[PDB]
């Protein structure tokens, strides 16, 4: 078989099924639908950045928090866009695209409620993704955005 270090995290059920490990593979030998899968032999046996970005191997929150210096400001809002709740996430993505703050938005769309990771560069296409998908989602569109050559994105 083809050995993969992250199999212990996946087989134990600790895996968050976030899909971060598969988008970072520089050989594109990892795919993600509802769980990580090797489509080819890994020469490192998974001893690489798929294992190192995994939030279930190590959170790395302390080193990230002291650099990000997060704070907490609580607000609530609603927008003209119809969304899951107030449609705030879509309204914010629409604003960032329209004001040239991002080249594209990494959002979750759907086909029969099956989540689909998409790269959105137009506001009209944002409306189709404005709703919660409670099925497992992926971050696959971030890899597509990279192949497209997009400089900045919102996820």
């Amino acid at each position: 078989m083809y050995e993969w270090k992250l199999n212990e995290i996946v087989d134990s059920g600790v895996c968050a099924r976030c899909g971060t490990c598969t988008i970072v593979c520089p050989n594109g030998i990892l795919t993600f639908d509802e769980r990580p899968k090797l489509i080819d032999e890994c020469l490192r046996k998974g001893h690489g950045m798929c294992f190192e970005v995994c939030p279930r191997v190590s959170s790395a929150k302390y080193q990230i928090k002291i650099r990000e210096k997060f704070y907490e400001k609580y607000y609530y809002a609603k927008s003209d866009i119809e969304g899951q709740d107030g449609g705030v996430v879509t309204a914010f993505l629409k604003y960032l695209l329209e004001n040239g703050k991002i080249d594209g938005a990494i959002v979750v769309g759907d086909e029969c409620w099956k989540p689909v990771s998409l790269v959105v560069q137009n506001a009209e296409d944002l409306l189709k993704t404005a709703k919660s998908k409670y099925a497992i989602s992926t971050l696959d569109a971030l890899r597509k955005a990279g192949e497209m050559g997009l400089e900045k994105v919102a996820v």
Binding site: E8, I9, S12, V14, P55, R56, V57, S58, S59, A60, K61, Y62, Q63, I66, R67
Partner: protein, 310 residues
């Protein structure tokens, strides 16, 4: 909702423990001073207290935790504490318990490590400057501050460098240089005996100092029975770009600095270090200074120091 999710998490971790299922203790990286031992257990590093001074209540808490969890007690060469043999299930409980008693876990990772200070002035008979308050000021301003790689500061009370200021990212050493008062000096010869570097020359009815050898220990001023030796220059001598570990790099002697100047200098050096660092967790300050040039690096540090208004 946060508490309901945390309770569900605690329930699942306990269930896995009871059924001998695999657990990845990924949340241990939420805290500072956490490391994994060769045997699979963890060690918790208490960030060293300024000057290596610990209250009996502080040591007693470490002793209670060690006995309760059957952990080994280790003392570090930066005068810190480490609790070895901690299970991943108890790491978070111990860190929060230590935090309540003021014992912050840290001095680990790419950040400013525990400041190392000697007893110095008021404690050591060779001490020329206060080291305990300076260490507290530096700890209050930069403790656990992120950097491209580990950053270590040492404060020595005199030029004997007990805490190695010459091989630290930033080294501070107390200095007191002498000058001879010819009206009071009678060539008794006592000062030459207290000088370890042998910088003094006794000639007839007077004495001299070789300033290329003198390290400014001030022993000759203190031990002159005729008060013929006076303070020429005094203060905190600063070094920058020192390092030890895989390789030894001697820090460069800068100049005498006031406490406010030292705080400004430490901050600016960190800013210029972060600006020019290309490889986090590999490049120490010395490597970044060498690559961009000491002159270019230090002239930027000076420009930023002049701009400082707080």
């Amino acid at each position: 909702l946060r508490q309901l999710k945390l309770k569900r998490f605690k329930k699942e971790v306990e269930r896995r423990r009871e059924n001998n299922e695999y657990v990845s203790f990924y949340w241990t990286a939420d805290y500072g001073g956490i490391g994994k031992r060769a045997d699979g257990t963890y060690f918790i590093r208490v960030r060293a207290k300024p000057g290596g001074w610990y209250k009996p209540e502080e040591i007693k808490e470490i002793l209670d935790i060690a006995e309760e969890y059957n952990a080994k007690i280790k003392v570090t060469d930066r005068a810190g504490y480490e609790l070895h043999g901690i299970s991943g299930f108890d790491v978070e409980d111990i860190v929060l318990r230590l935090r309540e008693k003021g014992l912050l876990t840290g001095s680990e990772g790419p950040l400013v490590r525990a400041t190392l200070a000697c007893p110095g002035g008021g404690n050591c008979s060779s001490g020329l400057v206060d080291t305990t308050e300076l260490a507290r000021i530096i700890e209050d301003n930069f403790k656990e501050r992120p950097a491209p790689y580990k950053f270590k500061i040492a404060i020595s009370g005199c030029p004997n460098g007990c805490v190695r200021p010459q091989v630290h990212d930033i080294g501070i050493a107390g200095v007191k240089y002498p000058k001879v008062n010819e009206e009071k000096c009678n060539g008794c010869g006592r000062c030459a005996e207290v000088c370890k570097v042998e910088a003094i020359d006794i000639r007839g009815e007077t004495s001299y100092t070789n300033y290329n050898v003198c390290v400014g220990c001030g022993k000759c001023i203190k031990n002159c029975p005729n008060e013929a030796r006076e303070v020429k220059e005094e203060g905190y001598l600063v070094y920058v770009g020192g390092k030890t570990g895989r390789e030894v790099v001697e820090g460069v002697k800068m100049k005498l600095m006031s406490v406010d100047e030292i705080i400004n200098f430490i901050d600016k050096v960190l800013v210029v270090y972060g600006k020019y660092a290309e490889k986090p967790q590999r490049e120490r300050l010395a490597a970044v200074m060498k690559r961009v040039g000491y002159g270019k690096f230090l002239e930027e540090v000076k420009e930023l120091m002049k701009k400082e208004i707080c």
